[PDB]
Symmetry: C3
Subunit: 138 residues, 3 copies
């Protein structure tokens, strides 16, 4: 009887960061991360596209309540990340390298705590227009 669909919302946030691993030497960190290892940091206007999936509810015509998704993304992404320094203001990145990959995983994990089981499909993070990460929970 029924249709599955994927629904996405895009938002952006501003954050600064520095790429470095506490396990590596200062020289190793420079060789590996180059300009991204700048000691005082750099920054991005991150874009995040969150995709959920499920059945199109025949009564409402939606996979998910859109207000709820706004609230969920506001709580899981904007509040903790927006206008923040990832490595100093977000406790999770005290011991985790703030690569775009790890930002995608962090966002996924934050969303899975609010969202109904089985509904989250994909998190996509643009560090810049040209550099993208997609995480699907695999």
């Amino acid at each position: 009887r029924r249709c599955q669909a994927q629904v996405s919302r895009r938002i952006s946030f501003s954050a600064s960061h520095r790429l470095y691993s506490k396990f590596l030497s200062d020289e190793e960190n420079l060789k590996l991360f180059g300009k991204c290892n700048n000691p005082n940091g750099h920054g991005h206007n991150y874009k995040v596209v969150v995709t959920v999936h499920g059945e199109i509810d025949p009564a409402t015509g939606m996979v998910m309540n859109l207000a709820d998704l706004k609230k969920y993304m506001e709580e899981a992404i904007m509040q903790p990340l927006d206008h923040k320094n990832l490595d100093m203001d977000v406790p999770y990145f005290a011991d985790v390298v703030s690569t775009t990959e790890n930002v995608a995983v962090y966002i996924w994990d934050n969303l899975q705590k609010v969202l109904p089981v089985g509904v989250l499909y994909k998190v996509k993070v643009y560090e810049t227009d040209n550099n993208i990460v997609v995480y699907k929970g695999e």
Copy 2:
């Protein structure tokens, strides 16, 4: 065997609509759809990406000729939807809620009435730059 590929074409159309259900009351439609339930409607420049798939023809190099795909899209999307009020001018939406999910399904179904069997892979609809639905016939 020969290579298989996905080929897409993007178009846009302008339409107005209003989100409301026949099954819910005035109070309930307002709580669920909020500003989208505005009695006199609102509107969008919808963007649609239609993807087809198949073998790359070894003599012509094409999965599908883009001039054909433009004609199918003109018949299945532009003629019925462009510069229209969805809820009043498109009979299908007389008793279906015009959410972006249901628009993606409507376009899929129209395309299938018009296209050769087995070629459609995906229909993606942007209601705005930030709100997207993907339907893959599942």
Copy 3:
């Protein structure tokens, strides 16, 4: 915990081409390819998104070092294609129609000559903003 992810990089290149098949007469070529068959050619600012996948490395927080990806893409896409006439300057297209489908396959194949095994996931080519091909090695 190991986490797989997709990582993409986008670049562009300028090239000219002409669409025609040695298996068609001039009339047929003109009928099939229309304005794309213009004898002196036409051109595009092609955009390419290359997507790799794999495990997020716990030490570096990356699936793949960007520097490498950029090198591979420079060698597989920019050097052979950028500011070129596809049909006259790229030997591969001497006997292959330079459709966007065949450009995606060509890029895929070039990339596989230099990427490690099991890393290449997707090649996406935009011939224009509105005409896209995706190839996944199928």
